[PDB]
Design a protein around this ligand. Sequence first.
Ligand SMILES: [Cl-]
Ligand SMILES: [Cl-]
Length: 164
Amino acid sequence: MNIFEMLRIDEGLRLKIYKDTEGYYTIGIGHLLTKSPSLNAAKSELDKAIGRNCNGVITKDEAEKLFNQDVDAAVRGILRNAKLKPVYDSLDAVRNCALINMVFQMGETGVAGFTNSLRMLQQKRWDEAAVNLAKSRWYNQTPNRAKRVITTFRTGTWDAYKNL
Ligand SMILES: [Cl-]
Ligand SMILES: [Cl-]
């Protein structure tokens, strides 16, 4: 398992504009287009992202390209963030995928807000971090994915994604 396969399982793949769990216009593999309620604004953002008149639909190749760009950005974001980098530097490869997953979903800012959990992760207090991460809107709104990610931080293995 790797970050791409992981996110692909959590985000799925849709080639037509859709609304995510929060109701925001999205496409491809969880690529957020806009928080605005206007479908036209989304269509505009899509064309700008792809470089052509898409009329709300893209190809699989286009979806994968946006995906590579998004994973790269999430990684770069972590590495430039003063609160996130130290955590990332402290973790093993499997657990860092869980951190990338969160950033991909909630953004750098959102993740930087889990101050307490972040400190527990840095200290390698896995079970404690797991409980703390669960006390969040994130866990209450998307419990299945949150459990997978949390199990990943807790065990340092891919068990939660095996058999999916
Ligand atoms: Cl809570
Ligand atoms: Cl979920």
